[PDB]
Amino acid sequence: VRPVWFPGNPPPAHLDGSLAGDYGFDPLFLGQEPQTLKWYVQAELVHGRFAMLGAAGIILTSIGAKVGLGFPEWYDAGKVVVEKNNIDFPTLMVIQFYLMGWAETKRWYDFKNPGSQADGSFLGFTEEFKGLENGYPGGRFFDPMGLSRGDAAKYQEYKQKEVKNGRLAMIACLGFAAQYAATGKGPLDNLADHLADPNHVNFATNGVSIPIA
Amino acid sequence: DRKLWAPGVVAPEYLKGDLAGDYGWDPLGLGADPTALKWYRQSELQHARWAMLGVAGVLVQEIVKPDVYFYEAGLPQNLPEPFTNINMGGLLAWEFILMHWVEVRRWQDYKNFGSVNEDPIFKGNKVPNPEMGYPGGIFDPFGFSKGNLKELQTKEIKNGRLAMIAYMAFILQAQATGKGPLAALSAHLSNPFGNNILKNIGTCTVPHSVDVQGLTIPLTCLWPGSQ
Amino acid sequence: RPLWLPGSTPPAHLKGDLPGDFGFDPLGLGANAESLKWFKESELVHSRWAMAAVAGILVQEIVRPDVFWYNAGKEVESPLGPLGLLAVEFFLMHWVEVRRWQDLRKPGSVDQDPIFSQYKLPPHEVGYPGGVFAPFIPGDLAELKVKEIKNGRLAMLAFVGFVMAAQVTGKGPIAALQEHLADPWGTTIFSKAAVVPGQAVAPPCKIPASVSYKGIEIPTPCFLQGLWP
């Protein structure tokens, strides 16, 4: 009925199309168990959201780098910020780990006991941490626009858009890493080199991707 | 029954002959979806009309102005007075605004049939619009639709298809030889065994790029010939 | 019924009740009742602020053609110090915004005058105070409300255009209008820049990166200059 990752192949039993972006792609059966699939769903959503933020930031910084704005590349921004501003790298790492630890720990214990964070033990906030579904934490803090509490069809469509954009951003980040390790320049520099000559500037002519070329 | 495109073939079940110019030709089956079929019919009508306008424009331009190349006629240095060396940005702005308005109206007519016939400023000025892609009224002031519209629409779609083929032939002829269709026809008539596609092919007269005032526009031929 | 797209089906959450309802919500940000109630006040405040700002910029340029509005906060000297002016503005604006916010969350709760117990605002809607705030109302209430929201939307887009034109050309609204009328085919944004697969040119930012205001170097950058076409 619904389209799958491999046309003609029947979709697995653990993938019935209830989740967003369900194409029945699981040849290794890593998510056959329900709890394991739940954990992997939250992991994929977090991965896609982080990948989306990273892809947007990398694209914007490379845009500012191509134009005469002085923006450093994404593979040198850390050194530029730490050396330009008197910022201690271990101190920043510890602060980031503290904030991420608090947020991810609350999220983890909410995954173990759904709705437990809504008891009011954190400054009295209750409905802001009640949670809607697995990997979809609705509330006035995470969703102040209230898009998750109205027009169910639009919400499901946005869920499909979010999972697809997340997978695309993950592939984009992997492409950024491979492009930097193979060509040595930024993603927009590679795009300009390819647009200048697409027949001779690609992965088949970089001299690194195809060793027999 | 109507005549099909191939002798002995069987026309598709979705092509019974209701629309004009239906030869029962659909090797890819792109007309299986009715919504997609209606959209493709509108797209074919737009392509047919635009191609007829382009073919007639190229021919009349080559007749009236035989020294101006239709391929390079888009340059600002080839525009006639008083539009010579005009800023192409404002020209693009004009075309974008007007074309965007009319195309949005046409698209809305396709999505919701008979919902944008009335003039939004002067009430009472509407168009009859019998079918999709056939507004009429102000668009057909001579009133030639009050008769046999089936054969007229058939002639329109057939002439449009011939014009589509003709304009693509014009593009490839100008890309391989570097001259207008009338000039290329005269050159072929001068020596048919010397000026044909057997020798003119493989050469792409279109340059690599063009510098229209400040920005550079990349150009290419339809085939990997010799630049 | 007037709509933002003739012959289009408006969204289910828009039934044409609120003023200026033209069935325009592709993202569905107004589907929720509470979100729509808050956004209505936000849009009203934005409308009035933008109308006041556009009128101020126009009168400022017409009366004073030598003072740039973008530089209005820089080349204006007053006996009242900038810190004192900021403190006065922060306290007064904080007081009025607190009263408005409390009326939003709790209607009919801050309509009473604290200094004098005899003054009190009459019952009204949220976002439309009335009473002392509306001494003269010439015309229909609903008609004037629709006119207010339409003028506010136009003023919001006008202020955005003012900022962008002042950042791209460095001229005021009247100056930009005259310059555009002088050479309309070459002074539009399409004439100033274009993007192609082989080249990406954008107009330069006429606003300096830093402004020396009493030796502090206030950064004044062009809004998303890297994303400029």
Ligand code: CLA
């Ligand atoms: C996120 C999608 C994506 C996109 C849009 C690009 C785009 C580009 N890549 Mg890249 N790449 C990607 C993913 C992507 N890549 C991934 C996941 C990897 C790891 C295997 C790489 C590894 C890679 C290398 C080593 C190189 C490039 C290079 C390039 C540039 C041109 C030459 C080329 O086509 O090489 C070929 C790219 C591939 C064979 C990767 C294709 C695999 C992905 C999954 C398909 C993406 C296609 C997408 C679905 C269709 C377009 C999306 C949309 C517009 C419709 C070009 C701008 C070259 C460069 O840097 O220019 C100098 C270069 O040498 N890429």
Ligand code: CLA
């Ligand atoms: C968004 C509202 C707004 C803002 C922030 C400004 C801000 C500014 N204006 Mg301006 N103005 C506005 C609206 C606004 N104006 C409107 C609507 C008009 C049309 C009547 C004007 C007409 C105007 C002129 C003619 C001039 C300015 C000038 C100035 C600058 C210095 C004047 C100053 O503040 O000293 C203090 C001002 C006074 C001490 C005068 C008394 C202030 C009265 C009593 C306050 C009125 C209260 C008001 C009715 C309440 C409505 C609130 C609502 C707008 C939110 C300054 C940056 C001057 C300038 O260009 O600088 C060189 C100048 O020449 N404005």
Ligand code: CLA
């Ligand atoms: C509020 C309506 C409005 C109006 C009347 C104008 C008018 C003008 N703009 Mg501006 N602009 C606007 C909004 C507007 N803009 C917005 C929202 C932005 C941010 C995207 C910009 C960004 C912008 C830039 C960067 C530039 C201009 C420039 C200009 C001037 C040159 C021609 C041009 O139109 O360029 C192009 C204008 C646009 C691409 C945006 C126009 C879109 C608006 C929203 C249309 C409003 C439609 C409405 C029915 C008509 C207004 C009513 C009117 C009859 C009173 C011109 C006087 C140029 C200039 O400075 O002059 C030298 C210039 O470079 N505009």
Ligand SMILES: CC1=C[C@H](O)CC(C)(C)[C@H]1/C=C/C(C)=C/C=C/C(C)=C/C=C/C=C(C)/C=C/C=C(C)/C=C/C1=C(C)C[C@H](O)CC1(C)C
């Ligand atoms: C499904 C399945 C199942 C079956 O059974 C089997 C198989 C086949 C195996 C499979 C598959 C899988 C896969 C594909 C995976 C992948 C993933 C990824 C890629 C991720 C990423 C992911 C990615 C990510 C997160 C990323 C992120 C990023 C980021 C943050 C960034 C950041 C940054 C920035 C901004 C800039 C600066 O300057 C630097 C930094 C700091 C660096």
Ligand SMILES: CC1=C[C@H](O)CC(C)(C)[C@H]1/C=C/C(C)=C/C=C/C(C)=C/C=C/C=C(C)/C=C/C=C(C)/C=C/C1=C(C)C[C@H](O)CC1(C)C
């Ligand atoms: C049906 C089907 C289906 C099945 O299933 C499959 C298959 C087989 C695939 C199919 C087929 C298809 C086809 C054939 C297609 C084709 C088309 C065309 C040709 C078009 C053109 C089309 C064409 C066209 C529009 C054209 C147009 C033109 C124009 C505008 C022009 C303009 C101009 C002129 C005047 C001149 C000047 O100087 C300049 C210019 C400006 C340049």
Ligand SMILES: CCCCCCCCCCCCC/C=C\[C@H](O)[C@H](N)CO
């Ligand atoms: C001048 C000191 C002002 C306060 C400084 C920060 C103190 C932080 C205390 C925040 C209070 C958190 C809990 C607040 C309300 C609780 O929900 C109720 N007391 C539970 O019944």
